[PDB]
Amino acid sequence: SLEDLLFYTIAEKIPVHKFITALKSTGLRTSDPRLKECMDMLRLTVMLDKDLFKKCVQSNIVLLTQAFRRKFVIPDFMSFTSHIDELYESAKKQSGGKVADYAKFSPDLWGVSVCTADGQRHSTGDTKVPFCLQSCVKPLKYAIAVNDLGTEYVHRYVGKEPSLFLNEDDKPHNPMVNAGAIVVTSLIKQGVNNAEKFDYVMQFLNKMAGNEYVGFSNATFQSERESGDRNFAIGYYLKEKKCFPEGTDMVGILDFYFQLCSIEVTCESASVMAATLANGGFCPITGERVLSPEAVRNTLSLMHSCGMYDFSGQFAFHVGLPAKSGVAGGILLVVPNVMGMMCWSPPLDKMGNSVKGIHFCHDLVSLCNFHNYDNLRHFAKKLDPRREG
Amino acid sequence: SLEDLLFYTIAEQEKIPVHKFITALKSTGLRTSDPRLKECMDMLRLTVMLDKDLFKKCVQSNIVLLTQAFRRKFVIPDFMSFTSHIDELYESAKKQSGGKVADYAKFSPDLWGVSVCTADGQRHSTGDTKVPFCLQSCVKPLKYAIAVNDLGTEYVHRYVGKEPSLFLNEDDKPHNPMVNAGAIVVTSLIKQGVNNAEKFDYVMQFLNKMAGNEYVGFSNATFQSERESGDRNFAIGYYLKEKKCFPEGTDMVGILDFYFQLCSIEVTCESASVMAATLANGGFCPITGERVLSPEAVRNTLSLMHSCGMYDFSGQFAFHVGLPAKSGVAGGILLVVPNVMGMMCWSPPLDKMGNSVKGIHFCHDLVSLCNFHNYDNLRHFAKKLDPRREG
Amino acid sequence: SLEDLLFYTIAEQEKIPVHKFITALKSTGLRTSDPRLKECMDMLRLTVMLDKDLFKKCVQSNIVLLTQAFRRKFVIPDFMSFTSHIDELYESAKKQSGGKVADYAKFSPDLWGVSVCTADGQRHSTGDTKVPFCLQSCVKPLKYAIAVNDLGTEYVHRYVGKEPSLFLNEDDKPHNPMVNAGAIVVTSLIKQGVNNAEKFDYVMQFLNKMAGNEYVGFSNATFQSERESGDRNFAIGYYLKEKKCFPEGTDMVGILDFYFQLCSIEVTCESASVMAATLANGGFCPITGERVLSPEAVRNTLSLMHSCGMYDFSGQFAFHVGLPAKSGVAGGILLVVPNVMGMMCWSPPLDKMGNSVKGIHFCHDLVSLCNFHNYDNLRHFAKKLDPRREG
Amino acid sequence: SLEDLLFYTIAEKIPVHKFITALKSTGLRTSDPRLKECMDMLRLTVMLDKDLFKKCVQSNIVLLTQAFRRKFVIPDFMSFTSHIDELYESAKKQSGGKVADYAKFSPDLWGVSVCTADGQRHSTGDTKVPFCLQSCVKPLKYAIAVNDLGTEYVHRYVGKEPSLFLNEDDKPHNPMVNAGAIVVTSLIKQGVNNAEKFDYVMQFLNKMAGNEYVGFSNATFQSERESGDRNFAIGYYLKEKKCFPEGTDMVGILDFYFQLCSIEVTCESASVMAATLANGGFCPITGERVLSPEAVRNTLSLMHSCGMYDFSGQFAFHVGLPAKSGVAGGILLVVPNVMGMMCWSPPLDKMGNSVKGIHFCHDLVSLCNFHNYDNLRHFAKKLDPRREG
Structure with missing residues (x-):
């Protein structure tokens, strides 16, 4: 029998601690x-x-x-x-x-978490501190939207390529930019009031993170409605162009949009979210099915092309992984079929991406054959963590 | 014993006819x-x-x-x-x-062919896969691979950009090697110093390697047609010359002629499919076992195929298909499915954006069916089927 | 004696009836x-x-x-x-x-009127010149003149650009005062500090001066309609607020409301024609003799009318007509012929670019006929006629 | 009689010199x-x-x-x-x-000539040195074209507004930019060979300048075909887009184009050219009719909008006069109904306009009410040279 077979595998009576260390070892x-x-x-x-x-x-x-x-x-x-x-x-x-001068803590925090498609976990540094998803949430609500409504419907309202505000057919270019994220927000869970829509998204983020840490930063939500002139501008421009679904309260949607930007996570919990995206929509630490493969495919596509702001092409070229950065300092990173990750470090570069986090993603792919267009059979001097010796 | 063991598996009782062994081998592909x-x-x-x-x-x-x-x-x-x-x-x-067919091409609107060569040498064609057609812009990935393989990413990208799109980008480099300007600059880096006839032989050599030694030809008919309407290309050529876009001591009118030549290169669905497979296979020609390209060159070629490979239709294509590909005005679509196979679809009639109508149809169809999308999951892929598995 | 001499010129023999003197005066215009x-x-x-x-x-x-x-x-x-x-x-x-008529306006497609007031006070109308319509964007030159007159070119152009056209130009100023963004910034410089009702009375005062005291009104009907579809303007408003485009301590939502108000201001062809003439006349209202605008303000207003006054049709218009003008969505076209006269043409139905169809027709016609083009010659003007001369 | 009346006007016998000084006095x-x-x-x-x-x-x-x-x-x-x-x-x-580093003499030359619409002449500085029209010739060949063929025809081939190369209807934006000047060159005097076309333009420039100095700089013509890669590029792009009239030799037209750019004038002769443009197409020192009013109106229009390169709007705003600069250092300037001018000074600014010449045009209009939209009746503290005391 299996647990006999396995009992021998781990023994030659078994001291309990000696089995625990054996287990943590596997990841x-x-x-x-x-x-x-x-x-x-x-x-x-x-x-x-x-x-x-x-x-x-x-x-x-x-x-x-x-x-x-x-x-x-x-x-x-x-x-x-x-x-x-x-x-x-x-x-x-x-x-x-430079740290987002509008964020206001230590430029000496830095953390990386990994969660494999199999549940294997690892952290270094400040992986247990909560920070705000900011733009890191854009792929998530997009996944939610497509999961509930489907590609066809969702892309009646938003575009699927990079770049002004409006594309050829008067839709925001894609949901990784604010104009598009705002629209996507207006599609999620219509009819019910904002408080309820919000509860629903929080519930969805909970499944995504295997129930690890997901919180909310009212401090941030206030700074957002505070300095949101640029966002309000976009809102009215979108209203004028009839970009929203019928019966939408645009000022309501903006307020919702700001809450979503103020959702909290940690390197660890976020790495699990990323891991669900790596793993076909199945949360790797609970085995639960959270997102349609269709929502996952679409999300990974648009993260690839539009996830690192102005730096997206450079990134796609040298890294080849779906990622998404946010202004609090996060980089949600997905290596399809392998792991998800969350890198966090407050200081941003010119383009708005965590400096340390960008350094890390480049190094990661330069080391292992994780690049989208690396060959799993001939890959020169990189190493393949997927193989034994 | 290895050839014993296999003898036993194909022998049912102590002698095998030759036709039976042959017939069992064919089916493996x-x-x-x-x-x-x-x-x-x-x-x-x-x-x-x-x-x-x-x-x-x-x-x-x-x-x-x-x-x-x-x-x-x-x-x-x-x-x-x-x-x-x-x-x-x-x-x-x-x-x-x-x-509509390209009118500069005098080919049957009812020509249509598809060829497959897997990363292991498995072959399959169907339709007009033996007819020769010109690569045209399909050659752009290939000669860019050749450049980066002989010179290395860093150098090749001092001269050409690496991103989608007034002809020149911010750093006054053509946008990327998949557009004509980029292609003309790349053409100018290959086999520097020596004369054109040799540069040409040199590329053809390299294509033969990539095609596992199957048909690579050349159409003087087309090469003459190209140089007799290369007004837009001569313009690009002069503008690049002006913006100091070439390496030292480049003869621009000569590079333009070399470039018309490369567009006029001929292949068949079958031979092109092997080339595509070399790209699918980390640089090794899968029917010869021979290393043809640095995997660094193959990764780049693929990256840029995915992003700027389908003319104005690249974004739509990458979203819905998620496979590096390149089309050409002759009706060809070089398609790569990384780690699995290469393909080549040929059907002369183009749509509005310059891509083969049938080739495009076929490419979406392929990914509807199999979990070959860049961002499909190998574990959970809903209703799609995985040809890499057994049941 | 001056009134003797003139008595002799109108008296033919030693008594003049009053109706004869009146009738001789009318004809002089x-x-x-x-x-x-x-x-x-x-x-x-x-x-x-x-x-x-x-x-x-x-x-x-x-x-x-x-x-x-x-x-x-x-x-x-x-x-x-x-x-x-x-x-x-x-x-x-x-x-x-x-x-087609603007559908936000409920006016007869068969309304059409033209009024003339020369730099000397000579008057002429024809058609529906007594009906009141809203200035709309026709007000943009006027309030820009008011700004530059009270504050001076240098200051006003710290906040708005001075050239034709993503909403903001290089220096993050709206392009020019004749587009909505520019108009909203100008609106924000006038009568700073005091409250809106007063700023409004203050402008109306200034318009009355410019119109030699003829009809300037206001349409609450329109002002309500404007604030109930000012989504595009609120957007502009928020974007400007963000780019720090207003002066210190500007209430943006209030400025937007002030701006809808100004668009809703009413005039008639006749009264508007006098305003146009003040602009044609170096700033002096030609029927009151009163100075209303610094000539520095009048030159600028005119410069920008010539270059950005006819919406997307400004370049074509400046080439073929060569006269500063401004149109508005109500069907009005404020027209100035420097040193000669001002005009106002009103016909509600607009063409594709937002200009009155009849008003446009009329403006080209006018310059076909008389040598009034900015760049006609007063000596040699071929077949055109000069109304400034006698034979 | 008139010469009696006039004899008294100038006398009270007449010493000859005393009549000459009297005359030069009038201008x-x-x-x-x-x-x-x-x-x-x-x-x-x-x-x-x-x-x-x-x-x-x-x-x-x-x-x-x-x-x-x-x-x-x-x-x-x-x-x-x-x-x-x-x-x-x-x-x-x-x-x-900076002087055109590709020009090669003294950055210490500077000259202004005036020629009124009445023949009155004045110079200061280096007004008798010949220099190249360069882009200053663009309005002239344009006038010639329209004079011979008319607005309608000529604008089948080129545009009439400012700005890539091609406008809405695939015509160069206007004839003050190279793309448009090249096209305009292809319209002038078709059929005959280049040598003859050239003789014809030279003849036309002669009437325009009342027969004052017009020459040709082979030194410059060679530098032009020399460094003309940019121009050749435009040429092929124009050929490809079918911008030329039927039966055009495009390489031939470029060569013609370069000659025209190498035509020589002086402050003095050019000021007369400018004066003909001020004066309705009549050459003010010979009384000869040279250009249709239609060609003159069109030329003055497009000089206004497109004559000072990137600086055209700034110029139109603050100066209000039709002008046209060129890379050898000229500014052809026209004050309609009053005078024409030529300013020459080798050193250019960022935008390609003579630095001293730009300084001069601004000062000129700040002084007199020559601005297009100045009022001849109320004009504050400017002076009106057109009036007596």
Whole structure:
């Protein structure tokens, strides 16, 4: 039987701690939601045997086996993890950039979290501090919209390419720019009032993050409606051009838009969000299906072309990964079929992207064959974390 | 023993006819003419029943590969079913009879062909895949790969930009190598110093390598037609000369002539499909096993195909198809599906934006069907089918 | 004696009837209601035959001008013939029945009127010149003149540009005061500090001066309509607020409301024609003799009318007509012929570019006929006729 | 009789010199072509009397009277002339600018010539040196074209407004830019070969300048075909777009275009050209009709909008006069109904206009009410040279 087979794999009686260290090794976290029952059993008890063991691991056997038979998308997780630490310390040195002077804390924070498509977790630095999604949320509400309404409908209102405000057919160029994000906001969960629409998006972000940290920054929501002249301008221009769905309260939508920009996450929780996008719309730490593959494909496409503001082409060329930056200092990054990530560092460059975060993404792809158009079979001197030795 | 084990798997009882072994091999998708199969095929022709021993004698040579092929470890294992899908898509697009043909081309509006060469050498064609047509702008990715391979990204991009689009961008570089201006600057970096005839032979050599040595030709008829309406290109040429866009000591009128030549290069669906596959395959020609391009050159070529490869229709195309491709005014669409296969679709009648009507139809169809989109998931892909899997 | 000499020139033998003197005066183009003629007309009404003495008693007052008028030293001396030409042009354009009316306006497609006031006070109208319509964008030159007159070119152009055309130019100033953005910034410089009702009264005062005190009104109907579709203007308003385009401590939503108000101001062809003439006349209202505008303000207003006054049609218009003008969505075209006269043409139906169809027709016609083009020659003007001359 | 009346006007016997000084005073030049016979008579002879006088002045009486009865467009010419000298010395101080590094002489040359619509002449500085028209010729060949073919026809090929190369209807924006000047060149005198076309334009420029200096700089013609890559580029682009008239040799037209750019003039002769444009198409020193009023109106219009390159709007706003600058350092300037001018000074500004020349044009209009939209009746503190005291 599997838990016998596995009992031998890990033994030659078993000391409990010695099984925990074995597990964390595979990349998994003790807290893993899919590992609940097993941890519940172990928490009813310090030295297992085939009967005691089988008793606990029974309910989560398929997963535990796949982790211990090194069948995760990244077999040598410990090795891959120390490279990430190298990349982190390397990007730490880069001390350029200005903080959003309108943000107001320390320019000495920096964090990276990884969540594989298999649930494997890693962090370095300030990964547990909450910060604001800002523009990092634009791909998310877009996914939500398409998930609920579908490509066809959603792109009656917004465009699908890069760049003024309005494209050929008088739609905002795409939903990664404010004009387009504002429109997309007006499509989500119509009819109900804003408070309820908001509760709904928060619920959706919760599934996306496997229920890890998602919060809200009223401080930020106030600064946004505060300095939102530019955004109000766009709003009226959109109203005038009849860009919204019938029966829309435009001033209402802007207010909604600002709340969404003030949603909080951490490197860790966000990395899980990113991971769901890596993973076909399935949240990798709960196994729950959150987004239609169609919403995920569309989101990854437009992140690719339009995710790093003015720097999107340079980025697509040298990095080749769907990412999305935001003004609080985040870079949501997705490596399809492998992992999702969240990089956070307050100081931005001219173009509005986290300086350290940009340094990190470049280094990452220069190291491993994660570039969209890297070949998995011949890739020169890069390394492939997906392979054993 | 490896050729024993395989003898047992194909032998049902202690002698195999030669036609039965041949017929089992064909279905795996390989052609008998496969270059990595030459010795084996020689040995066989030099003889009608093999025993464990007379068979060992004919397969030992290319055994690693004969194994992977019979043990269905190819990139598309059930190649026969995948192939019937290609034919359905082909027939589906054969119906779409829109579009106007280029009028500078004197070709049948009812020519239409598709060829596939997988990253492993598996072949399939259907329709007019043997006729030769000119690459035209389809050549742009190829010669850009050649440039970056001989000179390296850094140098080649001192002279040409790397992004979509008044002819020149901010740094007074043409926008990217997939537009005429960019293509003319790239043309000027290849094989510097030596004369045109040689630069040309040199590229043709390189194309032959990429095509695994199948048909690469040349159409003087077209090359003359090109130089007799290259008013817009001469303009570009003079403007670039003025903005100091070429390397030192470039003869611009000569580069323009070299560039008309390259557009006039000929291929067939089948040979082009092999070229596409070399690009799909990290630089190795998949039917010769030979390294042709630095993977750095292949990544770049692909990047720019995805973003500026379909003329004004690139954005729509990248969103809906998500595959690097390049079209040309002759009716050709070079298509690459990274890690899987290369393709070439040829149908002369173009739509409004300069792309083959049928080739375009076919490309959307292909991705509706299989999870080949750049941003499809290999685990969860809803209703699409994965030709890389078994059940 | 001056009033003797003139008595002799109009007296044919030693007593003049009053109706004969009146009838001779009318033909010179003056109206009896002329403000610089008031005392003379009072004296006359206070009385039917004048002798050398009872006439001296009624003309001494405004004698300088009565002289210039009877001695044909006006800017257009044979005013009666010039007037019949205006009517021909009027009738010529009355035939042109193209164009759509603004649908935000509920006016007869068959309303059409033209008024003339020369730099000397000579008046002529024909068609519906008594009906009141809204200035709309026709007000833009006026309030820009007011700005530059109260504040001076240098200041006013710290806030708005001075050239034809993404809303903002290089220096992040609206392009020019004749487009909505420019107009909204200008609106924000006038009468700073005090409240809107007063700023408004203040402008109306200034318009009354410019119109020699003839009809300036206001349409609340329109002002309400304007504020109920000012989505595009509120957008401009927010964008300007963001780019720090206003002076210190401007209330933007209030400026936008003030600006809708100014668009809703009412005039008639006749009163507007006097305004136009003040602009034609270096700033002096030609029927009151009163200075209303610095000539520095008048030159600028005119410069910008010539270059950005006819919406997207300014370049064509300046080439073919060569006269500063401004149109508005109500159907009005403020026209100035420097040193000669001002005009106002009103016909509600607009063409594709936002200009009155008949007003446009009429303006080209006018310059076909007379050498009034900015760049016609006063000596050699081929087949055109000069209304400033005698034979 | 007129020459009696005039004899008294100038006497109370007449010493010949004393009549010459009297004449030059009115603004006229002794060499005046319309004063030929009179000067011929005086040159058959030193102390006239009514018989002797009448004898000489008879043939040119109408003109001489109009000059001596101060009936010229500028009555107080001597006064107006010293202001011009003020303006000249004022602009002389301004020592910025770079010379066309591709031109190659002294950045210390500077000249202004005036020719009134009445023949009155004045110069200061280097007004007798020949320099190249360069772009200053663009309005001239345009006038020629329209004179011979008419507005309707000529604007089938070129535009009439400011700005890439091609406008809405695929015509160059206007003939003051190279693309448009090249087209206009292809319209002039078709059929005949270039040498003959050129002879014809030279003939036309001769009438325009009252037969004053017009020459040709082969040195310049060679530098032009030399560095003409940009121009060749435009040529092919124009060929491709079918912008030329049927049966045109495009490479031929470019060569023609370069010759025209190498035509020489002086401040003095050019000022006469400008004067013909001021004067309705009549050459003011010969009385000859050279250009249709239609060609003159059109030329003045497009000089107004497009004559000073990028600086055309600034210029139109602050100066209000039709002008046209050229890269050798000329500014052809026209004050309609009054005078024509030529300002020359090698050093250019960023935009390509003579620095001193720009200084001069601004000062000129700030002084006198010559601005297009100045009022001749109320004009504040400017002076009106057209009026007596």
